[PDB]
Design an enzyme around this catalytic site. Sequence first.
Site, mmCIF file in Angstrom:
data_model
loop_
_atom_site.group_PDB
_atom_site.id
_atom_site.type_symbol
_atom_site.label_atom_id
_atom_site.label_comp_id
_atom_site.label_asym_id
_atom_site.label_seq_id
_atom_site.Cartn_x
_atom_site.Cartn_y
_atom_site.Cartn_z
ATOM 1 N N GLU B 279 7.653 3.520 -3.016
ATOM 2 C CA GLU B 279 7.613 2.178 -2.443
ATOM 3 C C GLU B 279 8.204 1.150 -3.399
ATOM 4 O OE1 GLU B 279 4.002 0.142 -2.714
ATOM 5 O OE2 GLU B 279 4.155 -0.841 -0.749
ATOM 6 N N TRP B 301 3.731 2.371 5.231
ATOM 7 C CA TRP B 301 4.199 1.275 6.068
ATOM 8 C C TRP B 301 4.390 1.705 7.519
ATOM 9 C CZ3 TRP B 301 4.361 -3.801 4.867
ATOM 10 C CH2 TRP B 301 4.309 -4.159 3.516
ATOM 11 N N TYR B 327 9.175 -7.931 0.641
ATOM 12 C CA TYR B 327 9.235 -7.779 -0.810
ATOM 13 C C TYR B 327 10.627 -7.427 -1.316
ATOM 14 C CZ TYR B 327 4.217 -7.336 0.086
ATOM 15 O OH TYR B 327 2.927 -7.533 0.521
ATOM 16 N N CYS B 387 1.677 -9.794 0.181
ATOM 17 C CA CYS B 387 0.349 -9.833 -0.420
ATOM 18 C C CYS B 387 0.428 -10.156 -1.906
ATOM 19 C CB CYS B 387 -0.366 -8.506 -0.188
ATOM 20 S SG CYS B 387 -0.594 -8.142 1.556
ATOM 21 N N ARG B 408 -2.533 -12.782 -3.029
ATOM 22 C CA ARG B 408 -3.281 -13.655 -2.128
ATOM 23 C C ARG B 408 -4.380 -12.893 -1.401
ATOM 24 N NH1 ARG B 408 -2.503 -12.615 3.029
ATOM 25 N NH2 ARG B 408 -0.644 -11.437 3.673
ATOM 26 N N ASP B 411 -6.651 -5.630 -0.602
ATOM 27 C CA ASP B 411 -7.408 -4.552 0.030
ATOM 28 C C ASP B 411 -7.885 -3.596 -1.058
ATOM 29 O OD1 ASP B 411 -8.456 -2.448 1.456
ATOM 30 O OD2 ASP B 411 -6.568 -1.893 2.420
HETATM 31 C C1 LIG Z 1 -6.683 5.700 -1.783
HETATM 32 O O1 LIG Z 1 -6.529 6.743 -0.896
HETATM 33 C C2 LIG Z 1 -5.237 6.906 -0.453
HETATM 34 C C3 LIG Z 1 -4.648 8.160 -0.461
HETATM 35 C C4 LIG Z 1 -3.343 8.297 -0.013
HETATM 36 C C5 LIG Z 1 -2.618 7.195 0.435
HETATM 37 C C6 LIG Z 1 -1.217 7.459 0.904
HETATM 38 O O2 LIG Z 1 -0.422 6.663 1.379
HETATM 39 O O3 LIG Z 1 -0.933 8.781 0.738
HETATM 40 C C7 LIG Z 1 -3.221 5.928 0.462
HETATM 41 N N1 LIG Z 1 -2.578 4.677 0.885
HETATM 42 C C8 LIG Z 1 -2.477 4.098 2.089
HETATM 43 O O4 LIG Z 1 -2.899 4.598 3.128
HETATM 44 C C9 LIG Z 1 -1.760 2.776 1.994
HETATM 45 C C10 LIG Z 1 -1.308 2.108 3.130
HETATM 46 C C11 LIG Z 1 -0.656 0.879 3.008
HETATM 47 C C12 LIG Z 1 -0.466 0.300 1.754
HETATM 48 C C13 LIG Z 1 0.226 -1.031 1.599
HETATM 49 C C14 LIG Z 1 -0.060 -1.860 2.815
HETATM 50 C C15 LIG Z 1 0.874 -2.353 3.727
HETATM 51 N N2 LIG Z 1 0.189 -3.054 4.699
HETATM 52 C C16 LIG Z 1 -1.150 -3.009 4.415
HETATM 53 N N3 LIG Z 1 -2.137 -3.587 5.153
HETATM 54 C C17 LIG Z 1 -3.344 -3.425 4.711
HETATM 55 N N4 LIG Z 1 -4.496 -3.994 5.401
HETATM 56 N N5 LIG Z 1 -3.599 -2.716 3.556
HETATM 57 C C18 LIG Z 1 -2.694 -2.094 2.741
HETATM 58 O O5 LIG Z 1 -3.070 -1.487 1.738
HETATM 59 C C19 LIG Z 1 -1.332 -2.277 3.248
HETATM 60 C C20 LIG Z 1 -0.932 0.963 0.626
HETATM 61 C C21 LIG Z 1 -1.579 2.191 0.746
HETATM 62 C C22 LIG Z 1 -4.522 5.805 -0.005
HETATM 63 O O1 LIG Z 2 0.545 -4.655 -1.159
HETATM 64 C C1 LIG Z 2 -0.422 -4.892 -0.460
HETATM 65 N N1 LIG Z 2 -1.583 -5.278 -1.026
HETATM 66 C C2 LIG Z 2 -2.675 -5.551 -0.284
HETATM 67 O O2 LIG Z 2 -3.669 -5.888 -0.906
HETATM 68 N N2 LIG Z 2 -2.627 -5.447 1.075
HETATM 69 C C3 LIG Z 2 -3.714 -5.691 2.044
HETATM 70 C C4 LIG Z 2 -4.622 -6.918 1.790
HETATM 71 C C5 LIG Z 2 -5.121 -7.208 3.220
HETATM 72 O O3 LIG Z 2 -6.121 -6.277 3.628
HETATM 73 C C6 LIG Z 2 -3.848 -6.975 4.049
HETATM 74 C C7 LIG Z 2 -3.039 -8.266 4.136
HETATM 75 O O4 LIG Z 2 -2.969 -8.694 5.489
HETATM 76 P P1 LIG Z 2 -3.476 -10.218 5.537
HETATM 77 O O5 LIG Z 2 -3.646 -10.750 4.169
HETATM 78 O O6 LIG Z 2 -2.380 -11.117 6.294
HETATM 79 O O7 LIG Z 2 -4.884 -10.269 6.309
HETATM 80 O O8 LIG Z 2 -3.095 -5.958 3.330
HETATM 81 C C8 LIG Z 2 -1.461 -5.045 1.670
HETATM 82 C C9 LIG Z 2 -0.358 -4.773 0.953
HETATM 83 F F1 LIG Z 2 0.772 -4.395 1.595
#
Ligand SMILES: COc1ccc(C(=O)O)c(NC(=O)c2ccc(Cc3c[nH]c4nc(N)[nH]c(=O)c34)cc2)c1
Ligand SMILES: O=c1[nH]c(=O)n([C@H]2C[C@H](O)[C@@H](COP(=O)(O)O)O2)cc1F
Lengths: 506, 506
Positions: B279, B301, B327, B387, B408, B411
């Site tokens: 990523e 994604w 990004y 984020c 900002r 998660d």
């Molecule tokens: C910890 O355990 C694991 C194991 C494997 C994986 C794996 O990908 O293999 C994993 N990761 C995820 O599933 C993952 C998904 C999205 C993002 C970035 C992102 C984009 N949009 C978002 N929206 C919200 N709400 N939250 C977010 O994190 C994001 C990052 C991690 C986690």
């Molecule tokens: O790089 C990232 N870091 C992160 O913390 N989030 C999480 C935070 C939150 O749960 C969500 C953001 O959506 P929003 O802030 O608009 O509610 O994604 C997503 C990513 F892609």
Amino acid sequence: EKNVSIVVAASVLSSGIGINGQLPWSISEDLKFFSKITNNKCDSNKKNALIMGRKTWDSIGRRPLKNRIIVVISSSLPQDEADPNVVVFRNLEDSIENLMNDDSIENIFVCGGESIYRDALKDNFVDRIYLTRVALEDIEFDTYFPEIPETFLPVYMSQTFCTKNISYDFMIFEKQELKSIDDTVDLLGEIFGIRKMGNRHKFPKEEIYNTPSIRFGREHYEFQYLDLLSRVLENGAYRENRTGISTYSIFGQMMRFDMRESFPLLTTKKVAIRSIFEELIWFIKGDTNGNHLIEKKVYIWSGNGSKEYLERIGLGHREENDLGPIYGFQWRHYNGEYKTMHDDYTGVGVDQLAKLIETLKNNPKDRRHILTAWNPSALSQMALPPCHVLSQYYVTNDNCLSCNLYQRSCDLGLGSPFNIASYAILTMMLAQVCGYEPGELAIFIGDAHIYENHLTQLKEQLSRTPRPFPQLKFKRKVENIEDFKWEDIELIGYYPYPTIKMDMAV
Amino acid sequence: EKNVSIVVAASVLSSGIGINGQLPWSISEDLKFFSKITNNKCDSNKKNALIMGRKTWDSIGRRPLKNRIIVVISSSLPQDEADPNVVVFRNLEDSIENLMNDDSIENIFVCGGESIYRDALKDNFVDRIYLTRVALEDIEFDTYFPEIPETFLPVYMSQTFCTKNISYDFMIFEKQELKSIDDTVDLLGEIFGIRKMGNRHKFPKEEIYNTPSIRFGREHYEFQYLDLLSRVLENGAYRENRTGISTYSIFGQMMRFDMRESFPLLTTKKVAIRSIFEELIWFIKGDTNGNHLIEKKVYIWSGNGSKEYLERIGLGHREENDLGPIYGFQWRHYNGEYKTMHDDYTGVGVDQLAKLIETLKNNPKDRRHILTAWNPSALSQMALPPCHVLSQYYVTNDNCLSCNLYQRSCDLGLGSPFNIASYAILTMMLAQVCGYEPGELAIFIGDAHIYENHLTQLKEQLSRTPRPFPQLKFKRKVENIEDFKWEDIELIGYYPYPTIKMDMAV
Ligand SMILES: COc1ccc(C(=O)O)c(NC(=O)c2ccc(Cc3c[nH]c4nc(N)[nH]c(=O)c34)cc2)c1
Ligand SMILES: O=c1[nH]c(=O)n([C@H]2C[C@H](O)[C@@H](COP(=O)(O)O)O2)cc1F
Ligand SMILES: NC(=O)C1=CN([C@@H]2O[C@H](COP(=O)(O)OP(=O)(O)OC[C@H]3O[C@@H](n4cnc5c(N)ncnc54)[C@H](OP(=O)(O)O)[C@@H]3O)[C@@H](O)[C@H]2O)C=CC1
Ligand SMILES: NC(=O)C1=CN([C@@H]2O[C@H](COP(=O)(O)OP(=O)(O)OC[C@H]3O[C@@H](n4cnc5c(N)ncnc54)[C@H](OP(=O)(O)O)[C@@H]3O)[C@@H](O)[C@H]2O)C=CC1
Ligand SMILES: CN(Cc1cnc2nc(N)nc(N)c2n1)c1ccc(C(=O)N[C@@H](CCC(=O)O)C(=O)O)cc1
Ligand SMILES: CN(Cc1cnc2nc(N)nc(N)c2n1)c1ccc(C(=O)N[C@@H](CCC(=O)O)C(=O)O)cc1
Ligand SMILES: COc1ccc(C(=O)O)c(NC(=O)c2ccc(Cc3c[nH]c4nc(N)[nH]c(=O)c34)cc2)c1
Ligand SMILES: O=c1[nH]c(=O)n([C@H]2C[C@H](O)[C@@H](COP(=O)(O)O)O2)cc1F
């Protein structure tokens, strides 16, 4: 042997405690503190003793206090034995000898007016002092709390609280007569040099630590600024910068302040609050004309806005104080085609501040309430890139508005006291226009530094024990955020130390 | 009675301490730790006693240690009196005679192989355990350090150190058997409810505090993330958000990590390090095509890139995974007129990353090394607003590259472990291209939250005592920062706890 503590609520400067046989104020929460601190005991079969003079015994109606034993010091009161919760002694000395060795009594409290406060300290009877510093001084007192002897050192200072727009603190004073972990960390610091991150963030030495006797009770949030100074004086790397004045700089620091019960205006130095506001409303109006601040006797942008400085950075085509698209322009006209400071930019650009106010009250839990000022397409046109680059806002479940700011470069001593109060006022303005209450302010800092010509000045500021924060209230509710005026601001209870002159590095 | 501590360096998982009569490793800084911990004494006219078995006495060449007294446990060695710095005893019990008779001994240290470690713990002779956890497990051991009995609790865990690409920790284990400020702070919390800011930032309860016995020694920087989890579970406000999954949210938090001696990859759960990299290089190349991650078996994604989600947020005109200007686009083409993910954006926009690399090595002390991704003119076109909105970089006087990130919305559970390692790799990449070394990483967070479907998982993660951070080294030096490949990255010494499945909120 038992403990003998003094409980007192005194003025912040003159240490006034009474007037015409009563208190100079009416603070409900302070009496509750007196109740909880004097009832605090370990054994349920014991009681605490509250010593007071006769005139103070009259002021509370000559009626007992629940679960406690009042000891009245009087030369005339009859030694009635009918009331076990009230006992009379002829002098303070015979009331300390009798309370101690009286196994039914666990703790002793002195709280009975100037005559009892003064003679309890002069005869060295007191172990602790519970002080409530009330920020009220332009009124009249007739009984005072004596100056605290040098044998006492402060060990705690609470956050500033507010009751009916009155600021007050809570302090503890003690009379000055796990280690295997500290040893191992020291040994690891000898083996690894700067390799151990703890050595890159050394705890500031006592000589640069503000009020160093307060080790575990640094609750007052002005310490979030004073301790950042100490951490810079201890770990700051001597570095050159764009100006001719080098700095001592560290990276990655934060300060957080409360805005519910106080306003984060530094008390260790008279901060020019009026100039802070006039700059903030100058930002809100989208104005980049540097003369509009000079026309209001505000000269903070004269140095970075002189014709000689602009020609130095390649902006000699600008007017005398045409600062270019900066904080004010990016807040109201982001990505706007900037020409000069005299043009009409109404409608052009992205009005971030308007969308922020609209989003704050329409989608409060939306975690995107962001106001940015870092526009790479316009940095070259700015007289100075934004120092406070990005702020985020947050609506709590109890309808409070907190603020987070990221500051890339922080001039501790000049810019930082302004940025602390500036974004505090801004959050309060946003809170009123959106119908919320003030919350918290956290400032995240990149390059936290001290200019070398501020060293003797800032070290002087560290020698000053902080005083309670003031209060900031608005005189009227505004329709639009742009309509705020300096006359609409009431600064209540600000008793700072004298101002400290510091030159700005251009 | 005197203190008897164990000094040992064992493997991180199987607790291996030796092989074929020698150590499985050669770590210089660990031997210096053994030297300083066994020489640390209070009385200059006393010495420390080091108990060891015969086979260990052979492994050190049968030569004395300066300023200390070696006690050898052997059934065959003659009890010769010619060497006063070496004494032999027939069993471990008769060698604890230093407590009673020999007053000349101040402290006692047991450090002499499995046979002496095991029966010293079985007979309850040990008060402390100084443990050096070495991250080496896929090698051969033949003598091990026994499992630490439940009667011991950890009280300290140092940061991860590095020697020849080997990660190691330092821990102290203790055998388990003024407060006037705490009372005053508690009482003030009863008077003022949420008005006291301390009550809005309550210290996490033991039931949600990771390894709660380590109170004052939380030096390991994974605690900066695990304690943020606990801080959220204690004070998190239940709030709705744009997804159907509510969160427990707090505002204004920070985490800082070391990058000189380790790489901040969480050990309490097997973090998919490969997906984090794929990523990040996807961001660096300026790529917004979500299929290029799915084509590399990276599906992070996919949720925010489904046809149904894009139509839900009003982007139904986009392709299946056309995430829009995000990004990657803002880093390389800021303020660029975005069309689709198939167009050629070479040259359009403001290449912040190129300017960042250019300024990092040409003007290192310039405090404007800022890479932003918050463009209000393009937020409506993004599949998701950024984020991690803004990062700043800083060159220390010893040629190290530190990094500050403002996030900002965080998660915790999914995005946060990714954001920690992502910007750690990014800082390391920038350090190599600019010719610097890794420094520190600080992450300042706005909306720090936990999704309610991550509660049982994150509480499971908090039950796992952290292990030393791994090492991340690059196999080759690159010409351009875009040329990094996954094969060019070596992850050394990563022994995490099993992975924890957590669903992402779309
Ligand atoms: C910890 O355990 C694991 C194991 C494997 C994986 C794996 O990908 O293999 C994993 N990761 C995820 O599933 C993952 C998904 C999205 C993002 C970035 C992102 C984009 N949009 C978002 N929206 C919200 N709400 N939250 C977010 O994190 C994001 C990052 C991690 C986690
Ligand atoms: O790089 C990232 N870091 C992160 O913390 N989030 C999480 C935070 C939150 O749960 C969500 C953001 O959506 P929003 O802030 O608009 O509610 O994604 C997503 C990513 F892609
Ligand atoms: N802000 C705060 O924390 C507090 C404020 N106050 C205020 O302060 C004011 C009262 O203080 P103050 O004017 O000093 O009066 P005091 O409360 O100190 O009481 C004085 C009386 O105690 C007796 N007394 C004092 N010293 C002696 C002695 N050495 N030997 C014998 N008897 C002694 C005398 O009574 P007698 O004539 O009978 O001998 C004297 O008149 C009030 O306004 C009160 O409300 C009071 C307590 C706390
Ligand atoms: N990583 C680390 O911190 C450390 C690692 N090591 C490693 O561990 C290995 C050695 O450990 P190990 O194999 O267990 O050997 P030991 O170091 O534990 O020594 C064992 C010897 O001590 C004597 N002994 C043990 N128990 C008794 C007893 N109850 N009564 C009388 N004598 C006793 C015996 O010698 P005898 O035959 O004379 O009676 C025995 O052979 C080496 O590889 C060494 O390098 C060692 C110390 C620390
Ligand atoms: C001696 N005196 C004057 C007075 C007033 N304010 C003070 N404030 C402080 N901080 N310290 C004092 N010693 C103090 N003393 C007193 C003492 C008790 C009460 C009183 O009404 N106490 C009740 C308080 C009831 C309540 O407000 O909850 C109690 O239960 O103890 C008032 C004045
Ligand atoms: C018992 N033994 C095996 C050994 C090896 N590594 C360990 N590592 C740790 N953390 N703890 C141990 N008990 C330990 N023991 C030893 C003991 C001392 C020395 C030694 O050379 N000590 C020097 C170290 C000199 C130096 O490098 O500065 C000293 O001054 O104590 C080597 C092996
Ligand atoms: C504490 O003593 C006093 C007393 C009175 C005043 C007063 O204004 O009356 C005062 N403030 C200032 O002089 C001041 C000047 C500039 C700014 C903003 C700014 C723009 N460009 C900058 N460049 C650098 N390096 N540093 C900066 O702070 C700035 C803020 C405050 C300080
Ligand atoms: O609001 C401000 N806050 C602040 O801290 N500075 C100081 C920080 C530093 O001393 C200088 C920034 O110049 P530069 O970061 O380009 O070196 O301005 C200026 C402001 F206007």
